[PDB]
Amino acid sequence: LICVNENGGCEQYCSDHTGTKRSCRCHEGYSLLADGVSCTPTVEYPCGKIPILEKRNA
Amino acid sequence: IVGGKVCPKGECPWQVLLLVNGAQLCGGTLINTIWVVSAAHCFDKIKNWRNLIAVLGEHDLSEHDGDEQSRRVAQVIIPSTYVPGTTNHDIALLRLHQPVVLTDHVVPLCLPERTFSERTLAFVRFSLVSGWGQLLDRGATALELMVLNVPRLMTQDCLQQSRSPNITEYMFCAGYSDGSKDSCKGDSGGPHATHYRGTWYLTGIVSWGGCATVGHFGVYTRVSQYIEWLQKLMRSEPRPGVLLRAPFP
Numbered sequence: 395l396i397c398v399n400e401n402g403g404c405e406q407y408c409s410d411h412t413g414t415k416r417s418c419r420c421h422e423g424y425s426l427l428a429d430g431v432s433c434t435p436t437v438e439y440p441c442g443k444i445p446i447l448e449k450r451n452a
Numbered sequence: 453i454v455g456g457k458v459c460p461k462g463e464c465p466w467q468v469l470l471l472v473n474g475a476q477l478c479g480g481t482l483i484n485t486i487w488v489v490s491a492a493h494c495f496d497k498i499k500n501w502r503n504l505i506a507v508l509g510e511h512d513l514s515e516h517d518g519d520e521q522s523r524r525v526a527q528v529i530i531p532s533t534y535v536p537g538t539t540n541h542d543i544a545l546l547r548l549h550q551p552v553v554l555t556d557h558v559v560p561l562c563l564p565e566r567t568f569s570e571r572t573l574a575f576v577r578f579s580l581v582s583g584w585g586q587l588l589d590r591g592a593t594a595l596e597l598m599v600l601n602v603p604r605l606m607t608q609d610c611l612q613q614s615r616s617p618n619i620t621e622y623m624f625c626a627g628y629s630d631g632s633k634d635s636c637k638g639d640s641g642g643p644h645a646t647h648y649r650g651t652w653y654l655t656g657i658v659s660w661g662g663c664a665t666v667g668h669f670g671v672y673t674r675v676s677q678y679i680e681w682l683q684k685l686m687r688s689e690p691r692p693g694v695l696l697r698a699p700f701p
């Protein structure tokens with residue numbers, strides 16, 4: 395997988411590595427799930443999320 | 453904002469209102485608890501740098517509902533390459549005197565990685581622009597925070613479809629050419645926010661150039677060009693004196 399295509403399958407940030415290697419990353423206030431692509435909030439108010447809407451669907 | 457709608461209270465929680473001597477100056481975007489991104493041009497005519505205020509959790513300007521948080525602006529950082537009264541490099545980084553407290557009504561927008569922004573975000577068609585700007589060309593400003601969905605254009609297409617400042621690599625076009633929908637005076641410095649896989653990111657800043665002018669598109673500062681510049685600054689110690697010109701790149 396490559397970052398330029400489909401975001402390397404990453405939910406957020408993507409880094410290409412030497413080989414057929416790829417690493418996904420997450421913004422501060424998020425952690426990467428074991429799927430190696432998904433980001434989950436680690437704080438109450440992570441960036442780029444709308445609380446009243448997150449709640450609205452919680 | 454022309455041809456938009458009211459942003460429901462709390463649905464635009466990263467939106468900042470900038471005031472000078474209690475008067476509406478510009479918009480901004482919260483990216484962290486102490487950092488706000490705006491437009492350089494907003495500060496062109498600033499006399500007393502010490503009377504700058506940033507308001508978070510604002511919605512309806514006519515009332516106080518207690519969700520509002522006001523902070524003094526401790527620092528205004530502008531790139532070296534910005535020339536007052538012009539359009540290129542129309543960006544500013546503002547340091548608040550004290551952090552805002554994150555709440556349901558006060559949340560930062562994610563400042564993305566450059567690569568991510570360039571490779572992915574830049575290809576998301578539609579993004580949201582917001583502010584308390586003019587509701588009409590030569591019209592009154594909004595009392596309630598407004599928001600507008602606008603499509604982004606490749607610069608080549610922008611130029612073609614348009615019919616006077618250049619569109620530089622530090623800019624992009626977004627909106628409509630039919631004069632129905634645009635960001636306007638009073639909106640400058642505000643966010644152009646892009647959704648991707650359940651999260652919102654800062655891709656643009658409402659710059660300037662009239663508004664909702666037929667044959668013309670809205671122009672936005674291309675935030676991706678500035679990520680590294682911003683990041684470096686955010687890691688830096690404050691300096692005496694509000695205004696700081698910092699080298700770019």
Ligand SMILES: CCCCC(=O)NCc1cccc(-n2ncc(-c3cc4cnccc4[nH]3)c2O)c1
Pocket residue numbers: 477478493494495496497635636637638639640658659660661662663
């Ligand atoms: C030339 C102006 C007078 C000089 C001066 O006062 N400079 C300092 C200043 C401080 C704060 C705001 C402004 N300012 N004036 C116009 C616009 C503006 C037009 C527009 C169209 N479409 C979208 C956004 C837009 N924004 C704008 O933001 C200027």
Ligand SMILES: [Ca+2]
Pocket residue numbers: 510511512513514515516517520
């Ligand atoms: Ca209010």
Ligand SMILES: [Cl-]
Pocket residue numbers: 522523524549550
């Ligand atoms: Cl303060």
Ligand SMILES: [Cl-]
Pocket residue numbers: 687688689
């Ligand atoms: Cl330093």
Ligand SMILES: [Cl-]
Pocket residue numbers: 501502693694695
């Ligand atoms: Cl000063």
